[PDB]
Design a binder for this molecule. Structure first.
Ligand SMILES: [Cl-]
Ligand SMILES: [Cl-]
Ligand SMILES: [Cl-]
Ligand SMILES: [Cl-]
Ligand SMILES: [Cl-]
Ligand SMILES: [Cl-]
Ligand SMILES: [Cl-]
Ligand SMILES: [Cl-]
Ligand code: NA
Ligand code: NA
Ligand code: NA
Ligand code: NA
Ligand code: NA
Ligand code: NA
Ligand code: NA
Ligand code: NA
Ligand code: NA
Lengths: 178, 178, 178, 178
């Protein structure tokens, strides 16, 4: 029995390019987390309490997704490498603009997973494509969700009354098409 | 065992300046109470039933805070001196203007406590700073709350529809960022 | 009514030095969080599942403490400024060495709060000293806790059997003197 | 409607190489089962009752996994071919050595599935890759589990006290990082 780079028994070696890609993806999700935290603060600063609560939860959920990846590396007997985290964006001119960045962030998170997925396929790492499959499924749901929130906010067309209505929807947990 | 000015056994004498400051602070909170009553009436007069209910409760709560201070003086064996209460403001041009006065009233209430706090520190009255600590903590929450209500009302920008939505929020007990 | 730097109604201006100190303290706690995450990974890599679970929870709790500070700034109508997060330490020669760093991290977190506290006292910011008081109280408990965990691990003197026993204690939630 | 080789209606023909690979994989899992039975006996012979119980359950679970594959062949209207089963290994010099073989057995089971998976991809048999996906997911968990058990036993470094502690963990059902 061989030992992996993190010292645990090694079921199957991992290509160093694939390892690096996963470690960077973990950074992407950690960065998405602090971005959603930044977005929650922006919403709180404008009394959009429902949006604040929503993004506070998204930040915690994205961090969980990141930790889920660190557990996979542990499971594969690979080393983790927790990286420097950039500061998030913190200023937006409108809620519509914030939601556009949020949607883009979710889509970019999926692109990162897709990048890791294709590397794993090239390396015939079937453990990793299997591991990623449900995360892609969740990303589809999140993209559908954030398209819904962005589109609904854009439909409001900057009217405060409509944005207060949506804010209250979010506070109630009405965050998807359902 | 010595007797305090109110006739009870005296654990520790209180500086007369500090006593006067507390007695005046009690007046401040009694005045905040009748102000919130005035504000509840203004809201009722305009069918803003949620705001009416909110301010009716604030008036009762502020009175309780005032009585809490009278109990402290009793506990310190100091005399109370319930003072003349000025008439409150009773006219505003808009709900936004009313909420501005309400926010200012809460902040001014905190300033009064801060004034008492600094006097107690000068007099090394640790009973009094300890007694005031949780009241300052509550004031932070109230300031955060009234900033939320004021900001949300200002966001409405005088639109009746938005103000009816917020009114209904208040009736439901949705009065903070949460 | 004046507006604070984050745009909300301003109950009382905050000195920019104090603001900066709080913003940096938020970074300290965010850094403590990712450090505990790093520590949880190290423990998982060595099959110390109880220590892994403990530090996984500490990481989430420290993040919550950080967010609690961001809410205070919101409450004070001050701007947040979420900063770059350094990479954590990730390598230790022994569990005893890891626990030493963990203890030091908790103590350094308290020192940071103490630094903010003294600045607030200089500025007579009683809202902030009151806000910090329960956090200092929690830090005392955490320091007592981490002294217990470190001392118990040191008592084991590197014996694997003893460390497995303690590991199982941690998995069960036995993490303090009780 | 055509009939498959086992006589049932045939939804889609299967390449004979892929069929043979699955039939041999069934043998692999049947062999893993009897190996874990052998391992349970070795542990029972040395009064390691927790390890005995663990491996007794693993043997039954591995047999279930094997039968799950036979059901897939039935579902695909393909013939099963239950093969001669070799005798398992039955002697080890230490629990650490036994656990090394167990870990290797789990990893080799995954390699067999990976081999079948790649054959199915070459044959564009999407039913089979889909069928295998959750089994690969389970194998990741089992590899993580057996790395944990092996690493924990190795950490004990042959000390009977530590091995008794771990034995009791296994009897309680504490068999993973959790
Ligand atoms: Cl908008
Ligand atoms: Cl951006
Ligand atoms: Cl208005
Ligand atoms: Cl006025
Ligand atoms: Cl140690
Ligand atoms: Cl260090
Ligand atoms: Cl051994
Ligand atoms: Cl062998
Ligand atoms: Na902001
Ligand atoms: Na980054
Ligand atoms: Na009136
Ligand atoms: Na008065
Ligand atoms: Na490590
Ligand atoms: Na940092
Ligand atoms: Na204090
Ligand atoms: Na035997
Ligand atoms: Na065989």
């Amino acid at each position: 029995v061989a030992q992996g780079p993190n010292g645990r028994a090694l079921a199957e070696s991992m290509n160093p390019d694939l390892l690096s890609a996963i470690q960077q993806h973990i950074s992407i999700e950690r960065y998405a987390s602090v971005t959603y935290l930044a977005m929650s603060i922006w919403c709180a600063e404008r009394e959009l309490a429902g949006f604040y609560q929503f993004f506070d939860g998204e930040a915690k959920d994205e961090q969980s997704h990141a930790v889920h990846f660190t557990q996979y590396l542990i499971a594969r007997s690979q080393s983790n490498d927790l990286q420097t985290l950039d500061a998030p964006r913190q200023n937006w001119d409108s809620l519509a603009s914030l939601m556009a960045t949020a949607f883009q962030m979710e889509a970019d998170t999926t692109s990162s997973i897709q990048s890791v997925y294709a590397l794993a396929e090239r390396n015939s790492d079937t453990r990793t494509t299997v591991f990623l499959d449900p995360l892609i499924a969740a990303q589809i749901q999140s993209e559908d969700q954030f398209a819904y929130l962005l589109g609904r906010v854009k439909f409001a067309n900057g009217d405060p009354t409509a944005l207060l209505v949506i804010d209250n929807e979010l506070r109630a947990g009405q965050t998807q098409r359902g």
